[PDB]
Amino acid sequence: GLIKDIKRKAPFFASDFYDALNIQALSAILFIYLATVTNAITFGGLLGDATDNMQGVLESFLGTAVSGAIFCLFAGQPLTILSSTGPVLVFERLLFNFSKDNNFDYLEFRLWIGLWSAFLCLILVATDASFLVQYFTRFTEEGFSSLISFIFIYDAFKKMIKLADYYPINSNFKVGYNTLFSVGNNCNFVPDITLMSFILFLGTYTSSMALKKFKTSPYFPTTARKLISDFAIILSILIFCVIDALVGVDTPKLIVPWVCLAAAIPALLVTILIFMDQQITAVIVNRKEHKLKKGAGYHLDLFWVAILMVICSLMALPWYVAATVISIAHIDSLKMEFLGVREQRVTGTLVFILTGLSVFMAPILKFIPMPVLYGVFLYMGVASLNGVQFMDRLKLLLMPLKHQPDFIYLRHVPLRRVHLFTFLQVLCLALLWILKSTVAAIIFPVMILALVAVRKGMDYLFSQHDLSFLDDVIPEK
Amino acid sequence: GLIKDIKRKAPFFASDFYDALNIQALSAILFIYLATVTNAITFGGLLGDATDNMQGVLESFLGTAVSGAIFCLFAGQPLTILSSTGPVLVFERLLFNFSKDNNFDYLEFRLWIGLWSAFLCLILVATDASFLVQYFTRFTEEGFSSLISFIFIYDAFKKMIKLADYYPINSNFKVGYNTLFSVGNNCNFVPDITLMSFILFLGTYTSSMALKKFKTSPYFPTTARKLISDFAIILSILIFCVIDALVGVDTPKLIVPWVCLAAAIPALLVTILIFMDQQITAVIVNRKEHKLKKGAGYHLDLFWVAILMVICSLMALPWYVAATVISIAHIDSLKMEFLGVREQRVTGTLVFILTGLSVFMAPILKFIPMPVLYGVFLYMGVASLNGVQFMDRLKLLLMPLKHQPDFIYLRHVPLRRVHLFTFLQVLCLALLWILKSTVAAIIFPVMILALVAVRKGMDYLFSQHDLSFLDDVIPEK
């Protein structure tokens, strides 16, 4: 079982905490704190349909406070961050309407939804959770990484067109006094927030992507160039924090404070997706490209999420599976120069402690504008697909032929097969995009099992292949 | 005289017009048309203090219509563009106040100001106009090129802080009906133009500088990449033209339609600066870096500006000396790949014909926003100091030492002298900056003769020098 997994993760606990005093370890904490407290508040409104008051503190903060805290001590590379996700949210919209017809119970119904689903998860940690060596082999693991990035980028722009529809421009001026507002007439709609917002938003993407490319620019000293190429995101929030302060217009800103066996069959459903989400939020984090790691825990974290599932279910707290875009944005920061990454254990868990400090003099977090935080979402989206192999060939359709690729000797004669392979890979994303639009994400791995099905169709046209995992840069000499 | 100069410029007239059918020759016309009709309208307001009605057409358009037209047929590399400039404008503020105490004559006084100044210019074309080989030798000709660029960039930002002070933000909202405007109360000041304006302005600089750097990016076909890297500026105006159209807020936009001998001594003054402006707006355009040119006319253009001086003086039209930033932005466009530039004669003179077409269905030029045209000023400012030598060393103070310079063997042992030389060159710009602030630009070459004076002070610390002209890239092998 997980005893063979906990045996190799055990002799590293003292080696990690004394590896966490570096300066850039401070960078990733207050960055991802700003990401997580944004990702907490942006789902607290969406989940705020069902669970309305229930406490003198909003439960989505205290939920993600303890759930990552007990996780990211050590959980089999705890570089991953637990938070809430897409499919669990849309399921609870369904389950609230499935319990809107008064099946005697709603929240206590969710208990026996949550309790037996952990029990099914405790059977799955006992039997086997290992699908790596024949299912997720370098196709449809970028093919999901490069699709959940495209949703998270598209979720960024959607959260501002909703902002633009909440702050509508009058678009009729230069005359003067004809747009008085007053239960009034003709002018009950705001000016000049949304035009300010796209300055901050497009700025802090163009700022943050500039200071990361600043690392190669020679026009500053090197040992300070590394210090600015790692504090890049946080002061890009600070620069546009005070530009919001100088320009006296406001904006949205952060503001922080028979029953049982019928509950078996939806617990049969949620233990599928929470299981299936955990692997693909792990196999992209494992990622042999991220060189010189110090362990790979697949069972105990899946055992860890079952432990926190019953304490979240008992206290009416939302179920929390590992992240996919924030974790690959986490471990972007924690790396030297390639020469390995890290194994920092406190940076993964200080971010939940500072999340646990709910107020932390909340006026110090009140004058951060909300649209600058959508920009650092769009930076984490675009930078999440940096090192994937699939983008290096989707930008090869547009690349004319008399140019240089990377790998040698095995696809230089089938040049046309490259253009055929990625077009097949682009083709399956369009299926998964439009099935995400309908109600088919609650059955979540059906866009993964059908996604890995065409990997078996690839076996009918076979040759030598460097289209396989554990092999990213090969010098051959 | 100029007979030896007109003798070599004569055997090229038929060679130029048949050299003007290329596609990128169309690019530079409608770009610089948009620059010149902006530079006409932006001085027509400033000169609009004195000459108020005087015609059913604004005289600043028809002024720059004919004055570049008869010039840029052929005038000794007519790549330069005539327009109005700084020092002539501030002189006419002085002369209007010098004639505000009713010295019997204002406009007809300017006749005998203009007429004898041309007569003094006709003596100076007869005697000698050749100061090259001992005064403007690669120091203080970048030293003026890299200073008039810094004024033109600083003039761009100043024209929007004036725009921001004309459209002031209320900066007090989210409540609602407390800011009614009504001879009213508390709300007689506009919203949401100036926040729109900095989107267009910073955008069309970041857009235009991106599409010029697009030329090296492989992710598009090459023979279309050259077509987009030369239409870069004009459609960057078009892209942000329609973004202004979609976003329904307006902005400022383009909207086009005893006496004699006392007049000797100011005509003694203006024939200094108009003479002195012409050389430094020519020696930066001559520029042996711009390889493989086909002539160098120094006398006949100075004879040409005297011809148009009397027709401008007779019709009450402003005096028009050659440009310094637009001309180096002109000949940026007209170049192949380095491999020479051009000798196009119609592109320099079609731009005044289209300027001469004043209306040209002026509603087709009415919905171009004025703040996108300040952006293409700031692009022409920053790109004017591209190839200067002085910026390549002012960005060497910030460059730490274990790095690569360009030239070999003569300043690699005096590394410290490089840091001393440019600091001396930075020092004289600060003198010229603060003397430009006071009333010392009307005596304009006193910041040039004192500028070339420290070139003689350089002779006391002499060695071998590659700090000299006609020598820019040297392979030495």
Author numbering:
A (entry chain A), B (entry chain B): 401 to 582, 638 to 712, 735 to 814, 826 to 965
Task: Quote the study's own text.
Among the SLC4 transporters, Na+-dependent members function as either symporters or exchangers that mediate their specific physiologic roles in different cell types by thermodynamically coupling the transport of Na+ to base (HCO3− or CO32−) with or without simultaneous Cl− transport. To further improve our general understanding of these transporters, we investigated the structural and functional properties of human NBCe1, a Na+-coupled SLC4 symporter, using cryo electron microscopy (cryoEM) and functional mutagenesis studies. The transporter is a member of the anion exchanger family belonging to the APC superfamily, the second largest secondary carrier superfamily. The 3.9 Å structure of NBCe1 provides a common framework for the Na+-coupled SLC4 transporters that underlies their functional properties.
NBCe1 was solubilized in 1% Triton X-100, purified and exchanged into PMAL-C8 amphipol resulting in well-dispersed particles. By combining ~185,000 best particles, we obtained a cryoEM reconstruction at near-atomic (3.9 Å) resolution. The reconstruction contains two NBCe1 monomers with identical structures and its side view resembles the iconic double-headed eagle with its body, wing, head and foot corresponding to the gate domain, the core domain, extracellular loop 3 (EL3) domain and the cytoplasmic region of each monomer, respectively. Each NBCe1 monomer consists of 14 TMs (divided into two structurally related inverted repeats: TMs 1–7 and TMs 8–14), with four amphipathic helices (H1-4), a short (single turn) cytoplasmic helix (H5), and the loops connecting all these helices. Densities for the cytoplasmic N-terminus (Met1-Gly400), the distal portion of EL3 (Cys583-Leu637), EL4 (Ser713-Trp734), intracellular loop 5 (IL5; Glu814-Lys825) and the cytoplasmic C-terminus (Asp966-Cys1035) were less well-resolved due to the dynamic nature of these regions and were not modeled. Our atomic model of the NBCe1 monomer is arranged into gate and core domains. The region corresponding to the middle of the transporter within each monomer formed by short TM3 and TM10 and the antiparallel β-strands preceding these TMs has been proposed to contribute to substrate coordination in other transporters. This region of NBCe1 is accessible from the extracellular side as predicted by HOLE2 representing an outward-open conformation. The pathway contains an electropositive opening from the extracellular side with an external diameter >12 Å and the most constricted region (~2 Å diameter) formed by TM3, TM10, and the antiparallel β-strands in the middle of each NBCe1 monomer. In addition to Thr485, our structure and mutagenesis data suggests that Ser483 (the β-strand preceding TM3), Ser484 (the β-strand preceding TM3), Asp754 (TM8), Thr758 (TM8), and Thr801 (TM10) are also involved in ion coordination.
